[PDB]
Amino acid sequence: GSMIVFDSDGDFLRNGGTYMLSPPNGGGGILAAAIKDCSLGVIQHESYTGWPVTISALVRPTFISTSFQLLLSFAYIPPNVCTKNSDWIIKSSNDFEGTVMLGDDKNPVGSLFFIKSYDSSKNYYKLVVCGGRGDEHCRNIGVDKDENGYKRLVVTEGEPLVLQFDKVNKGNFAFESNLSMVV
Numbered sequence: 001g002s003m004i005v006f007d008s009d010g011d012f013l014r015n016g017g018t019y020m021l022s023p024p025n026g027g028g029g030i031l032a033a034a035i036k037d038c039s040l041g042v043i044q045h046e047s048y049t050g051w052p053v054t055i056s057a058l059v060r061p062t063f064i065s066t067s068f069q070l071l072l073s074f075a076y077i078p079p080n081v082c083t084k085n086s087d088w089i090i091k092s093s094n095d096f097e098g099t100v101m102l103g104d105d106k107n108p109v110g111s112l113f114f115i116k117s118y119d120s121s122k123n124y125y126k127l128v129v130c131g132g133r134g135d136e137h138c139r140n141i142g143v144d145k146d147e148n149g150y151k152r153l154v155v156t157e158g159e160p161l162v163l164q165f166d167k168v169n170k171g172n173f174a175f176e177s178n179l180s181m182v183v
Contacts, residue, residue, distance in 0.1 A: 002067035005115050006123045008164045012063040013115075018054045018075045019165040020173065024124055027143065027161075032074070032102060033150050033182040038082040042100040044143050044151040044161070045182055049172045051076045053088075055115075055165075066125075069112040069134060076173075077102070078181050088113070090129055090155060095146060097139065098129075098155035113141075118162050126160035150182075 005013035008022060021030045029050020032040040052075040057068040064070070074086035085103040087110030093099050103110055111129060118124040127141035140160035143151050153161065172178070 001117075002065050003117070005064045005066060005125060005165070008123070008166045010123070011167075013055070013165055015061055015064050016054070016056050017064075018052045018168055020052050020168055021050060022164045022166045023162060024122070024164055025162050027151065029178075030153070031182060032077065034080065034082055035101075039104060040077070040080070040082050040102040041150065042088060042102065042153045043182065044153065048182070049169075049175065049178045051179075052168050052173060058112075064115065066114065066116050069114065071110055072113055073110065074102070075168075076179065078179060080181060093154075096144065096152070096154040096156065100141065100153040100155075114138075118160065123164065125163050125165070127163070128160075129155060 007013055027044045028046035029048040031051045033043050035041045054073045054075045056071045072088040077086045083102055083104050085108045087103040089101050089103045089110040090098045091101045114128045115125050116128050118126045128138050130138040139155045142154055142156040142158050143161050144154045146152050
């Protein structure tokens with residue numbers, strides 16, 4: 001059901017806007033870690049505020065609807081030897097149906113996501129990815145641990161990563177320790 005997404009303040013989510021992903025049920029912020037040349041995988045991690053995400057629809061209205069296919073990119077990544085790009089993309093895995101990675105130097109356009117309602121009462125949302133014609137074989141984005149202890153954002157039919165979208169706090173974000181890659 002097509003409805004407009006709200007940020008944590010109750011304002012309409014803006015197309016092309018940048019928001020801090022804020023899981024209401026704990027676990028920490030969203031950022032990336034190197035997966036060994038090397039590629040960056042999107043992770044959740046305690047004691048990290050995380051990096052803001054820029055959210056853009058394929059059409060140009062001012063506000064985002066749950067029915068819109070979306071491109072997601074980190075508004076910040078640290079200098080690194082893995083990739084120049086920050087677009088979220090889905091890649092296969094020997095451990096999951098898929099995981100959320102960042103595009104390498106040759107794939108600057110990422111995968112298509114939807115923001116779907118999780119709890120209408122509290123304005124909680126989740127991310128889903130679909131295939132085929134655009135809305136087929138849909139899967140949740142959840143969180144799960146890989147062999148090396150990273151809480152990876154994964155494609156799954158299991159319980160999703162629950163989210164709110166916070167307007168960017170310029171303090172919590174710019175903290176130098178928050179801006180370094182997770183090792």
